[PDB]
Amino acid sequence: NSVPGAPNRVSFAKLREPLEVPGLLDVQTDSFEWLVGSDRWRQAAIDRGEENPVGGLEEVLAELSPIEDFSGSMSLSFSDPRFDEVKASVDECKDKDMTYAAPLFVTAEFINNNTGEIKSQTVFMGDFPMMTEKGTFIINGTERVVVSQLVRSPGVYFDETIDKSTEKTLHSVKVIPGRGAWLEFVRIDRKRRQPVTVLLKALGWTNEQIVERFGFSEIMMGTLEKDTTSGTDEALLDIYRKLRPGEPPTKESAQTLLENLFFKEKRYDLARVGRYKVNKKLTLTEEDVVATIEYLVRLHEGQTSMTVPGGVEVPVEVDDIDHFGNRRLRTVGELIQNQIRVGLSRMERVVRERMTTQDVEAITPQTLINIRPVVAAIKEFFGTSQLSQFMDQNNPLSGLTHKRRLSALGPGGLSRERAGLEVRDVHPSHYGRMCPIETPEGPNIGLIGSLSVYARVNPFGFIETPYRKVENGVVTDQIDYLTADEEDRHVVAQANSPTDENGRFTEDRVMVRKKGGEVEFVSADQVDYMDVSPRQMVSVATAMIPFLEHDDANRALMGANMQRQAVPLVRSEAPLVGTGMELRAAIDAGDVVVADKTGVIEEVSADYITVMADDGTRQSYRLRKFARSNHGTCANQRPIVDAGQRVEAGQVIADGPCTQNGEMALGKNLLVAIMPWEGHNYEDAIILSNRLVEEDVLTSIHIEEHEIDARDTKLGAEEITRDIPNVSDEVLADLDERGIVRIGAEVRDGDILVGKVTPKGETELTPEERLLRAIFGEKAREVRDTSLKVPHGESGKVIGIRVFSREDDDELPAGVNELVRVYVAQKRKISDGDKLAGRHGNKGVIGKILPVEDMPFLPDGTPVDIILNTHGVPRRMNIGQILETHLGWVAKAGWNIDVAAGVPDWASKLPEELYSAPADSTVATPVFDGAQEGELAGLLGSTLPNRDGEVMVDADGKSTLFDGRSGEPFPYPVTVGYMYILKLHHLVDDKIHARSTGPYSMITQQPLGGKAQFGGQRFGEMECWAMQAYGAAYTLQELLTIKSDDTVGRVKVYEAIVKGENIPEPGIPESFKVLLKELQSLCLNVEVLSSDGAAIEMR
Amino acid sequence: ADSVRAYLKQIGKVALLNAEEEVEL
Secondary structure, eight states, X not given: OOSTTOOOEXXXXXXXXXXXXXXXXXXXXXXXXXXXXXXXXXXXXHHSSOSSOOOHHHHHHHHHOOEEOTTOXXXXXXXXXXXXXXXXXXXXXXXXXXXXXXXXXXXXXXXXXTTOOEEEEEEEEEEEEOOOTTSOEEETTEEEEEOEEEEEOSEEEEOOOOOTTTOOOOOOEEEEOSXXXXXXXXXXXXXXXXXXXHHHXXXXXXXXXXXXXXXXXXXXXXXXXXXXXXXXXXHHHHHHHHHSTTSOOOHHHHHHHHIIIIISTTTSBOOHHHHHHXXXXXXXXXXXXXXXXXXXXXXXXXXSEEOOSSSOOEEOOOOOTTSGGGEEEEOHHHHHHHHHHHHHHHHHHHHHHHHHHSOTTSOOHHHHOOOHHHHHHHHHHHTTOSSEEEOOOSSHHHHHHHTTEEESOSXXXXXXXXXXXXXXXXXXXXXXXXXXXXXXXXXXXXXXXXXXXXXXXXXXXXXXXXXXXEETTEEEEEEEEEOHHHHTTSOEEOSOOOBOTTSOBOSSEEEEEOSSSOEEEEEGGGOOXXXXXXXXXXXXXXXXXXXXXXXXXXXXXXXXXXXXXXXOOSSOOOOSEEOSTHHHHHHTTSOSEEOSSOEEEEEEOSSEEEEEETTSOEEEEEOOXXXXXXXXXXXXXEEOOOTTOEEOTTOEEEEOSSEETTEEOOEEEEEEEOSOOTTTSOTTOEEEETHHHHTTXXXXXXXXXXXXXXXXXXXXXXXXXXXXXXXOTTGGGGBOTTSBBOXXXXXXXXXXXXXXXXXXXXXXXOHHHHHHHHHHOOOOOSEEEOOEEOOTTOOEEEEEEEEEESSSSOOOSTTEEEEEEEEEEEEEOOOTTOXXXXXXXXEEEEEEEEOTTSSOBOTTSOBOSEEEOXXXXXXXXXXXXXXXXXXXXXXXXXXXXXXXXXXOSGGGGOOSSTTOBOTTOEEEOOTTSOOOHHHHHHHHSOOOOSSSSOOSOOTTSEEOOBOTTTOXXXXXXXXXXXXXXXXXXXXXXXXXXXXXXXXXXXXXXXXXXXXXXXXOOOOOHHHHHHHHHHTOHHHHHHHHTTTTTOHHHHHHHHHHHHTTOOOOOOOOOHHHHHHHXXXXXXXXXXXXXXXXXXXXXXX | OXXXXXXXXXXXXXXXXXXXXXXXX
16 A cells, blocks of 8 residues: 555555554664765755764764874874775675775875974775665675664663662662773772762862762761761872772872873763763763762652752652663664774874884875774674674565664673573563564573664664654644653553544543553543554564464564564465555565656566666666575565556566565465364374475475685695596586586586595505506596585585686685586475474474375365364464464455445444455455454355355354365364465475484594584483483493494494494593593593503503 | 783882983993
8 A cells, every 4th residue: 555556455454554664674774874974864964953964984083083192293184084986786796705895085184283294195994885775785795784782871870779688778870981981889990998978079179068069968978977088189099099909109190090081081982872861861070970979869868859059950760771761772883883983093003103103204194094903893893793694584574674673782782691581571661662572582582672663763872663742632643753761751642542533532531651651541631642553562574463463472473583484485475364564564675676766667578677767767677586595595586567567666566585566475375274184283283285296386496505616735726627536427427628517407415516626645555556556557646536516415406607717817815716606406395394384473394295185175176285283273372373264265265245235233343345355355454453353253254156156164264174085074164264374494305414424523533513514413411311311321332432432433333234243342432532631731640540450541 | 910010010110220320330
């Protein structure tokens, strides 16, 4: 709706969206456009707000300018940052393994105060990685995402903790800056035993001022009365030895210590967040450190209002660190800014010192500037940083939620292990800002969350939510974005409250949220603002669960997580029963092709689509075709338009991997039967119609990337070649001249992809080997065979080949002559052992797939595709999955009213224009206003036919299925319908592993785990416990000796199995021999003694 | 606490020579 080509999907929503969903990729683009400060951000901050917009880059550049040594004789000044056009295109970078970047330029002015000369020089800072339209970065060729971090905003926050002993009240205040040491009430720099009074005198304030300013504070006088410090300089000395123990002080150092620590701007960093927080709540000013202690004493006393001695009144109350008013949220632009600031300060060090030893008047902006640390900050931020992640793409939805994710971990925030469950719990202020229903199930719960649908980030880093202000029981069209602080100020009316004519309060009383937040029921009298719509609190994926309101938050969370876990199917059918978001989540993802100008289609090819605008301009779009995604899913796109077609701006020209006709399709609509069936679908297992194989409905493609390089070796140069030292001409049968597999070839496990060879010697062949050489006349070849073969358990067709050669100009790291990448792809039929699931958190493996002949089949002879077990459903509170199973049948078979004569009672509340839909029409039930139970039943009866006028499902959503095995009907009516089930990225082909012998570890001889290494299974501590409880000594010994660590015994056992002899006696585990050696290296003398003869030697 | 702080404390206890003493030594 409101989207030009939007498909027709009827909604049961009884409300009207007053506000379109904002562009939900915005959080990434705005943060970056602020950092680079392009005119797009300029106009934004000019047309509203402050009149001197300072880009993030300029903002950190103001801090540097100027650079002046202690002499002030020279000053190096910076200004005017500039970017050139991007080096290469995104597509070019992903291919060539480079990073998408614009070179940055700066004007550096060096001034000599003695000679009054000026030297102006243009400076090259480095290639500054830019952000794609899609909100990502290309770093060394891989698409990456910078997640936004949650942090404690700089400010003064007070906490009241009851005494562990006396039970008496205590505060306990803290002040956290942008940078510099932190203080707590004066406990400073983690130095206890500090009275808050001794420092108040350290500034030079005499005691009478204490008695004057302290006033009503009793412990304020008793602390100075107990404190033995006499004089302002003597207190600085009691502060000097606690802060700087080991250094005898000086009156010059005693005074500047306090001044330099906080007041001085260089050492103590005033934050715009901190500067704004406390300035209203009450660099660092002496005025500010007094108001701190004043606020505190007037807290423990119990008064709610503090009027500063010269200041303005504010409430005196405790602060909550989990309240979003106090919690940001450093966005990507800022995370980059901070890393740039670090790079400059490291350069300022070399700029300052450089001035001293450089011959004066021979120094220029360049000679003082060395850019190594500045670019290193950026490069070392995108790599190795936890906030910079490889974009998660198996489907557009996964990518779209990766951006919009906010996590509390990372540098500048708490560690995952330390933070308690108080931060993980949902706060009342998360409403409409951070989705409560979406987080990881692992022990990241509550630390990671996704930004809500209508949420929006503030220039200061606080999340805002849209509201519609109400005045005198009338809700206006005014929409005001409020932060958490200003939301606690007012009364938020519930999103759905009855609307009156031109609009006003209808219901006698209004649903409202207080500042508790504590819910309340008051009449229309006292309201100020109302909710923009239901699902403000919900996130994008959460908003995609039909009948969300019917599923417990537990199964909902699982449901959201698993949608982003699905994989694009070849066919990509859209959900029969949807919600609002499917349309707008797919376009905002960027994996769909949208037209930016109204016009008409000149050409449509599988390769590209051109449109002739009414503007006379010509736009074209190249289609992503079978592109391998980060985790190996398929990004293939298909055009949905035809040559003659007219089109409008913002319409959808081509479908992406998971989309159909513009809306997200994460799965297929399947005919479901909820009976338990012969113990096959049991304990969450699922059974499938073989139809889903024959007709490729659950089929999906997959693409693997294989890589090999030819480098320079101390003994020669590696050469890619077709000549392999020992092989039959058969293995080479699929290799071309150069020795790389031919396009379109079929490759099995162990087949050669790229032949390679490396020098070897001196060889010293075994005599038994040199004799066969003489006999069969095959010269021992000069070089070893190191060649690229396909990993165990993999297979497919060769799709494409990429070759980078040093002979060709190309490019490569030093030593690497030639690089060849091979892309293998395969069609994966839905297979027993694959994992499927619905949007409600219902998941299970495929346990069996039956011939379409024997399956529960409707009276039509229409077989059911899936049989889901009845037992898993009732106890899990996911019953929404049964609703959509019913609606699924409705939407598939169509229906009619219900009229005439009149409209029935249930439809009165009311389906509008919904009275009739044809067969196969698609439905939408927005989460928190969907279809309602009454409306389901009324629809459940409707409508024939299969073809013949007979009806296949009753008003209970049940049918009589015939067993395709015995041919007799099933005694009772069974529920059938259509359910939307997704194919998930856990697949049997990837998860099946087996090993007999294989590589062993270097230091320990144990087999090395993981499929890459062909590894074995870990038999762990707990497994050995189980083995010991059984009393199997020989089994336990075996697993721990000749099956892992025993270097002679593992080769003997093999020798025994192949000769059918008895399995020999085990030896000593190599790991134990290693332990003795490691204890010896600690100067621990560890001797293994027998009964005697005393010491035994391990050798 | 720090090892470099420890070494600076001791080298600080000596006194800087002027030109005449350096010649003397």
